[PDB]
Amino acid sequence: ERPTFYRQELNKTIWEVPERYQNLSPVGSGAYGSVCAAFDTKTGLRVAVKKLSRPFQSIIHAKRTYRELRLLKHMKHENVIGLLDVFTPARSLEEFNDVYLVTHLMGADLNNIVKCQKLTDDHVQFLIYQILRGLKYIHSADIIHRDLKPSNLAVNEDCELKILDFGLHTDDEMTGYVATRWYRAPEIMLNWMHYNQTVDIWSVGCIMAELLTGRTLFPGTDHIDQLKLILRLVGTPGAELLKKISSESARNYIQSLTQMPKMNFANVFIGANPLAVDLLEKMLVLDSDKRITAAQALAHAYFAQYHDPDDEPVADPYDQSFESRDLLIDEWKSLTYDEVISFVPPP
Numbered sequence: 001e002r003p004t005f006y007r008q009e010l011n012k013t014i015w016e017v018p019e020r021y022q023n024l025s026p027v028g029s030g031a032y033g034s035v036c037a038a039f040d041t042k043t044g045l046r047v048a049v050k051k052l053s054r055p056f057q058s059i060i061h062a063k064r065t066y067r068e069l070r071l072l073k074h075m076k077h078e079n080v081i082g083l084l085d086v087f088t089p090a091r092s093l094e095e096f097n098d099v100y101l102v103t104h105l106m107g108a109d110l111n112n113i114v115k116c117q118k119l120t121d122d123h124v125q126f127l128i129y130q131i132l133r134g135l136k137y138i139h140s141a142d143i144i145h146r147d148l149k150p151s152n153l154a155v156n157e158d159c160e161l162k163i164l165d166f167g168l169h170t171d172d173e174m175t176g177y178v179a180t181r182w183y184r185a186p187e188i189m190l191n192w193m194h195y196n197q198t199v200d201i202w203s204v205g206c207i208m209a210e211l212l213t214g215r216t217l218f219p220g221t222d223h224i225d226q227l228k229l230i231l232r233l234v235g236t237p238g239a240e241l242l243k244k245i246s247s248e249s250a251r252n253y254i255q256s257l258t259q260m261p262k263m264n265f266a267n268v269f270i271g272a273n274p275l276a277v278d279l280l281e282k283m284l285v286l287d288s289d290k291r292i293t294a295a296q297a298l299a300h301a302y303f304a305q306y307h308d309p310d311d312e313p314v315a316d317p318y319d320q321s322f323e324s325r326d327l328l329i330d331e332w333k334s335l336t337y338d339e340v341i342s343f344v345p346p347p
């Protein structure tokens with residue numbers, strides 16, 4: 001039943017939230033809205049409360065509000081950000097106009113760790129183990145992240161990690177010397193083909209490299225510069241991959257480059273644990289069909305210390321038949337409402 005809400009101006013707008021949430025402090029905007037840290041007095045947790053920015057302004061907005069909610073409602077894994085609460089001050093569909101999402105707030109992201117302390121090989125094991133464990137889960141529900149990078153990894157005081165912003169940039173946001181593109185699989189970066197979940201394993205290799213060396217693995221100054229950084233390391237594509245690049249235009253550009261062999265990763269990653277080098281070669285394969293999967297990677301010797309086949313769970317089935325559905329604003333909105341109304345908090 002309905003808790004009492006209180007109002008306050010934050011981030012230049014009125015936030016109206018249940019009493020349980022106290023000490024709301026703006027912490028900068030996230031995916032499609034402003035975020036505040038809060039103390040949840042009912043659970044004792046430090047939480048992130050996101051107020052969605054104009055969630056039903058357009059069809060595109062309405063459907064992405066519905067999508068984010070559906071996604072967050074489905075995720076129930078230690079290494080994936082789940083939904084602690086969702087609420088609206090509206091008392092009926094007629095007055096439904098705002099959506100607030102509540103999740104765990106961790107001390108920092110991986111960006112802050114990568115810059116602010118030295119990572120032992122053990123820290124790299126633990127962190128990558130945790131990303132692959134959440135990724136096996138995500139992938140098992142047939143969801144793709146597409147945008148895995150250190151700023152989408154929430155890490156706490158004890159190096160416990162949660163993945164954020166799965167299954168959700170403008171051409172301008174992908175332009176130039178920008179982290180928003182440094183972790184992207186080449187096939188998605190230059191639209192070579194119909195892409196799948198394997199793109200995610202590529203980003204994991206980029207992240208792992210960077211934890212090991214302290215440096216961005218492919219800090220391209222633009223798409224072409226980055227492509228060259230990638231090809232230098234992994235080699236130009238062979239005949240078999242060229243056929244799978246179904247963009248004739250892109251296939252043709254690729255073919256204009258002088259062929260290069262795959263470099264020796266032991267000389268690229270000097271000092272690195274040999275098991276880590278091996279895993280990097282298995283993740284950083286240009287042919288996406290041949291990259292190691294998350295499930296397979298968890299069973300790689302590098303994670304012997306953490307691997308436990310009985311505690312690496314799969315997801316319940318995720319119905320995203322809505323993705324290919326054409327609905328009006330008021331219909332995505334009604335659907336969203338039903339999802340808010342029927343939310344049951346975690347146990």
Ligand SMILES: Cc1ccccc1C(=O)c1c[nH]c(C(=O)NCc2ccco2)c1
Pocket residue numbers: 030031035048049050081101102103104105106107108109153154155164165
């Ligand atoms: C992903 C999400 C869904 C609903 C509400 C908020 C958010 C969100 O952007 C977010 C949730 N947790 C974190 C988080 O823990 N980030 C790590 C962090 C804290 C301070 C700096 O980085 C972000």
